[PDB]
């Protein structure tokens, strides 16, 4: 791809998300989602292989269905309110449609069935964009319409997302599908605390983006796409070996790491509102995420080691790859928990 065209397309992705973030009008919300999808479609097809075309086709179908459902919710709002302010919705039918459409754009279960496929089909930097930058616009719309979001529907989608993102991580050797099911589980975590404290929604979002960006940056630094290919990291770059795995111990949700910062705070906002059963169940399912991801941790820092002889040649060449913000993002994804009351900046 032409690098000027790459810069223009990435600024158009950022522009579409910014237009969703700054607009007081529903048509510009829809326009920003359309611009974001239209610009991110060549990011997936950076390598021009059939798996990227299949991934982009599935992504187009799901995001286009979500865009049309979003426009139907906007149209029903214009029926029952005659106006266009991005605020609470004035029909629970339009509220249910916009909640379903934003759950489709986030890939929350039971609309999760495109997230492990598309992330498998595309490269690691485009999967990084799909799992970090593309969450920002529908979570912003959910932040702006929460006086109309149905409680039972968002809790159903949240716990179903956490359970399915939990039980998706068993049978996988692909690093990208494991990041996709971790995405689904964390979106269930974010939308669990949305109608109780959306500051914890933004805290969970920022900690999730920092941990996901650290993990994809490590995957790009080592050029490893599977568990078995990740297993050779100890012999090539031994400093790369543990940083992946303390970041993934963070991504499970485990003290004293900063990935324990969102979930605890989420529980800290749901025991206030007299829900004791629901954060208990959701964080037991987070322990199930710890179960499978700790099995992957055992895979890399321990037993299944053995190397091949061509690795000896890689010892005579350093990484000339840009590991952009990787020490910064690795420090910010583990050691941030003693600065947990920084979250007041997200009000």
Partner 1 sequence: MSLVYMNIMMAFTVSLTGLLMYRSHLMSSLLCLEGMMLSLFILATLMILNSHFTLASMMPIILLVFAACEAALGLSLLVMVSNTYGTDYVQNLNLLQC
Partner 2 sequence: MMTYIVFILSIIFVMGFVGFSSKPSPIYGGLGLIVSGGVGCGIVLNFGGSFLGLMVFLIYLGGMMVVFGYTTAMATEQYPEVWVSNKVVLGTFITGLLMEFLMVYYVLKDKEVEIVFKFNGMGDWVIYDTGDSGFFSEEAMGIAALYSYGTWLVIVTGWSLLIGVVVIMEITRGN
Partner 3 sequence: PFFDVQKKLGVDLDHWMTIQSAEQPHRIPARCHAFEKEWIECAHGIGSIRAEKECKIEFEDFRECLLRQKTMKRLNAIKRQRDKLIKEGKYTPPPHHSGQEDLRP
Ligand X SMILES: CCCCCCCCCCCCCCCCCC(=O)OC[C@H](COP(=O)(O)OCCN)OC(=O)CCCCCCCCCCCCCCCCC
Ligand Y SMILES: CCCCCCCCCCCCCCCCCC(=O)OC[C@H](COP(=O)([O-])OCC(O)COP(=O)([O-])OC[C@@H](COC(=O)CCCCCCCCCCCCCCCCC)OC(=O)CCCCCCCCCCCCCCCCC)OC(=O)CCCCCCCCCCCCCCCCC
| Residue ranges binding partner 2 (CB under 8 A) | 1, 5, 8-9, 12, 15, 19, 27-28, 31, 34-35, 38-39, 41-42, 45, 48, 56
Q: Does 228 bind partner 1 (CB under 8 A)?
A: no
Q: Which stretch binds partner 3 (CB under 8 A): 24-32, 108-116, 212-220, 332-340?
A: 24-32
Interface with ligand X, residue 132, by CB under 6 A: yes
Least Cβ distance, residue 168 to ligand X (angstroms): 23
Structure tokens at 16: 């579409």
- What burial class does residue 167 get, using C-beta atoms within 10 Å of its C-beta: 0-12 exposed, 13-18 middle, 19+ buried? middle
- The whole-angstrom separation of Cα 136 and Cα 293 is 25
Binding residue count for ligand PC1, defined by CB under 6 A? 4
Instruction: Please report whether residue 161 would count as binding partner 3 according to CB under 8 A.
Output: no
Residue 27 in the binding site for partner 3 (CB under 8 A): yes
Nearest to 318 by CA among 255, 240, 205, 217: 240
Q: What gap in Å lies between CA 271 and CA 278, rounded to an integer?
A: 9
Instruction: Tell me the sheet residues that pair with 25.
Output: 85
Sole binder of partner 1 in the list 6, 79, 281, 302 (CB under 8 A): 79
23 counts as binding partner 3 under rule CB under 8 A: yes
Q: How far is the CB of 269 from ligand Y (least distance, A)?
A: 21
Omega into 256 within 30° of 0, i.e. cis? yes
Among 80, 271, 322, 340, interactor with ligand X by CB under 6 A: 322
Q: Buried b / exposed e across 52-88, counting CB within 10 Å, b at 16+?
A: bebbbebbeebbeebbebbbebbebbeeeeeeeebee
Q: Is residue 61 involved in binding partner 1 (CB under 8 A)?
A: yes
Shortest distance in whole angstroms from residue 57 CB to ligand X: 21
Q: Which residues bind ligand Y (CB under 6 A)?
A: 324-325, 328, 339, 342
Nearest residue (CB) to ligand X, 125 versus 227 = 125
Closest separation in Å from C-beta 333 to ligand PC1 = 29
The structure tokens listed for 337 are 């928990």
- Angstrom distance (rounded) from CA 132 to CA 209: 5
The footprint of partner 3 on residues 192-211 (CB under 8 A) is 202
Does 276 interact with ligand PC1 (rule: CB under 6 A)? yes
User: Where does this chain bind ligand X (CB under 6 A)?
Assistant: 10, 123, 125, 128-129, 132-133, 136, 202, 206, 209-210, 213, 217, 220, 322, 324-325, 329, 345
User: Where does this chain bind partner 1 (CB under 8 A)?
Assistant: 27, 30-31, 34-35, 37-38, 41, 50-51, 53-58, 60-61, 64-65, 67-68, 71-72, 75, 78-79, 82, 84, 117-118, 120-121, 174
User: Where does this chain bind partner 3 (CB under 8 A)?
Assistant: 18, 21-25, 27-28, 79-88, 136, 139-140, 143-144, 147, 202
């Amino acid at each position: 791809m032409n690098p000027i065209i790459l810069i223009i397309i990435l600024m158009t992705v950022m522009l579409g998300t910014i237009i969703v973030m700054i607009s007081t009008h529903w048509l510009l919300i829809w326009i920003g989602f359309e611009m974001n999808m239209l610009a991110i479609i060549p990011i997936m097809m950076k390598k021009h292989n059939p798996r990227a075309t299949e991934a982009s086709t599935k992504y187009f179908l799901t995001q286009s269905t979500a865009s049309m459902l979003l426009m139907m919710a906007i149209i029903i709002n214009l029926m029952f309110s005659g106006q266009w302010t991005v605020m609470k919705l004035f029909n629970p039918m339009a509220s249910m449609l916009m909640t379903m459409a934003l759950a489709m754009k986030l890939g929350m279960a039971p609309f999760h069935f495109w997230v492990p496929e598309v992330t498998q089909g595309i490269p690691l930097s485009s999967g990084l964009i799909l799992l970090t930058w593309q969450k920002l616009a529908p979570m912003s719309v959910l932040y702006q319409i929460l006086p109309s979001i149905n409680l039972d529907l968002i809790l159903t989608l949240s716990i179903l997302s956490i359970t399915i993102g939990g039980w998706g991580g068993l049978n996988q050797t692909q690093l990208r599908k494991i990041m996709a099911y971790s995405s689904i589980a964390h979106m269930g975590w974010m939308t669990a605390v949305l109608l109780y404290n959306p500051t914890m929604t933004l805290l969970n979002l920022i900690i999730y983006i920092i941990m996901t960006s650290t993990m994809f940056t490590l995957f790009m630094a080592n050029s490893t796409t599977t568990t078995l290919s990740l297993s050779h990291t100890w012999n090539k770059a031994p400093i790369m070996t543990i940083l992946v795995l303390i970041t993934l111990l963070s991504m499970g949700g485990l003290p004293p790491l900063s990935g324990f910062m969102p979930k605890w705070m989420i529980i800290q906002e749901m025991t206030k509102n007299d829900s004791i059963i629901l954060p208990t169940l959701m964080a037991i399912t987070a322990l199930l995420n710890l179960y499978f991801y700790m099995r992957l941790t055992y895979s890399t820092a321990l037993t299944m080691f053995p190397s091949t002889n061509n690795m000896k040649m890689k010892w005579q060449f350093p990484t000339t790859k840009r590991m952009t913000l990787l020490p910064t993002m690795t420090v910010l994804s583990t050691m941030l928990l003693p600065l947990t009351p920084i979250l007041s900046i997200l009000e």
